[PDB]
């Protein structure tokens, strides 16, 4: 079984029994056809995964952070398969393929097309393509069934807060394709190149969003100051209360088909 | 009969028999209910108003341009009605009055939304309210019938192009309201408020919308200049044969349903 | 077997056994020759299928939107014939030729006389065309039976009705199809060439049918807001009670022979 990595060419003959990922994204993908990963980066804290797909899967053990991977943590495990980062890994490539064949995909930075091409790559390296194919077809059909029950024109932008500043999630990042693929309105340019925007509070009120979804890296946060603003209150999502705080580790982390389903769910319980 | 306008209220007792207009939406406005100005200040030139317009009316008398209008023809035409642009005409606004009872109504500047008000207020103004009313609701429900049988997301702009450059008209631009009631995607940022963006060839680039319609107000123009770089051939519109020359007093000159609706049916020759 | 559909010839050896529809008319022509589908694109609600219908066949599972089908249910059923819309499902034709059989036949747009040829074709794709010919047969002399029992000279015009506007139903449309077999004469001209007329308020004044039959599609709705005008009560509808509401399933989204008669019977019903 052979796929295309971000090195060039990734094959494996035997099925892995123990798989080791360094990335939610890589997660996700194993958790929507039923394998449990026996080694995570999960930054010490399991709960940063969300429960949808921690909810399918058995525990893992950690390896340590996504940005620094402990290789002494991963070889105990002795895996059989390693599903790295080609952003977070690279350096740590040819370290991490004396333990087990290493397959490099993306994911930070990755929009929501490349996530599920991504997933399709998994499944045919892990001996699940038909199954991955079917999953990805029944994601896609749900997606679908999604925006065809959303009826609003409203617009409805995601971004991460904390105390150092806002950061839009913009139509490319992967949570603007999950919006764009549900029918949401974007009230970012159309021609935005980046997938997380620095966002003072002049581009805050002149983007004024329907609806701000902010995920706290921080309490207090930038949005804690701005509200010391007397203009802050006249921007729509402060007149309507359609400024909610809403899970960082689903909009912002946990890239992925199980995701993309929970922010769907979680967008309709937000429209009511 | 009485109307708010710019000006605060204006009265009339009488229907008025002699209209003249000052504007060529208001030409729109009258011949949309079959009435027929003795009067336009048309530039010296009838064509500038849009067939559309023309055919539904008899012929009128000129009165010169639109932004110095001759006194002395409007007087010898008799007319018992002026409705004149707020913007063009507020110096020789008493001077109109003593002619006779002068409508002082938006009309350069106005959006597709103003420009409605502005018609269903020559509706009473006339003495026709309850057919203007009609042919508004009637214009709406045309536009919104366009914008059901469209079924693109294609980038469409429209620009305006000179030996000097070019101007994009942006999503708040009379055509931009146009264009988004018909459902029609902008390239340009939701946010963006000015109506006009001076256009140099990077931001062409950057922008490249999958249609580029383009009004010359000069032969040759910056485009002329611009094919000789050879980036042009890039653009979309460039590839797919999509940069088209439309009307410019359509696009540029005439505001009104019946120029709205004309858009709508160039628009649908265009996709199709 | 071999049928002409809309790429002429669609063939089958075996009797199909298992199908599945993608349209309400289809569902019909199969009631009507007590054939139960296994799967129906109901848009999740099978009262949008008139009960005439539903009471001949078995209850059947849900295969999703008439716009946009699942073809994930659709290939859990597991069917040995598809019949989908000509016009809705042309892109995803060959993706439904992948799952079983596909029959490509028209039903939105359709008149009264291309519905009863489309069934006919369905007929003889399942293996009934002897008993298809006769019900056709049969419809149409019960049909002619209603005509020759129908003496009444008065204008009946049916109407969807909505908070958007109202769209009456000429002779050139499905509901008009079966009004003009069953011999009653419409308000509108015998010149008129579109199948739904926009129609304003002032419009049905000077229409003015002796019964006005509406399928109402929202609440509130149009007729509401109509209903306030004094000049209301002039309507000969609201003269004699004959302001009728009537199934906007069986007038509007149901087409074929038992729609057709459940019809003729209501319109019996009423004239008694």
């Known amino acids: 079984r052979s796929v295309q990595d971000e090195q060039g060419t990734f ?18 993908a194993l958790a929507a056809v039923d394998v449990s990963p026996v080694g995570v980066a999960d930054d010490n804290d399991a709960t940063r995964v969300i429960p949808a797909v921690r909810d399918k899967i058995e525990p893992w053990q950690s390896v340590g952070m996504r ?10 495990l002795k895996p059989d398969l390693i599903i790295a980062d080609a952003e977070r890994h690279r350096a740590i490539y040819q370290d991490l393929q004396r333990i087990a064949p290493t397959l490099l995909l993306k994911s930070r930075g990755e929009t929501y097309k490349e996530n599920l091409e991504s997933a399709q790559k998994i499944g045919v390296a892990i001996g699940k393509q038909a199954q991955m194919t079917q999953r990805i077809e029944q ?4 997606m ?3 925006k065809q029950h959303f009826a609003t024109q409203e617009t409805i932008q995601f971004g991460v807060v ?11 990042s992967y949570a ?21 925007i620095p966002t003072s509070f002049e581009l805050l009120l002149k983007t004024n969003p329907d609806w701000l979804l902010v995920g706290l890296y921080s309490q207090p946060n930038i949005v804690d100051e701005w509200r010391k ?38 967008l309709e319980a937000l429209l009511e």
């Open 176 to 196: 603007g394709g999950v919006l764009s693929t549900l029918g949401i309105q974007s009230p970012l340019a159309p021609s935005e190149q980046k997938a997380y």
């Open 144 to 146: 679908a069934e999604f």
């Open 229 to 266: 603003n007397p203009l802050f209150k006249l921007l729509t999502a402060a007149k309507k209360q359609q400024l909610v705080e809403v899970s960082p580790e689903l909009w912002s982390l946990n890239r992925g088909m199980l995701a993309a389903e929970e922010i769907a769910r979680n």
């Open 11 to 28: 094959e494996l003959e035997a099925i892995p029994q123990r798989i080791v990922v360094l990335e939610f994204s890589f997660v996700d």
């Open 139 to 142: 994601h896609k059909q749900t």
């Open 162 to 172: 904390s105390d150092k500043g806002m950061w839009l999630h913009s139509p490319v």
């Open 67 to 76: 940005s620094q991977p402990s290789l002494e943590a991963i070889a105990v």
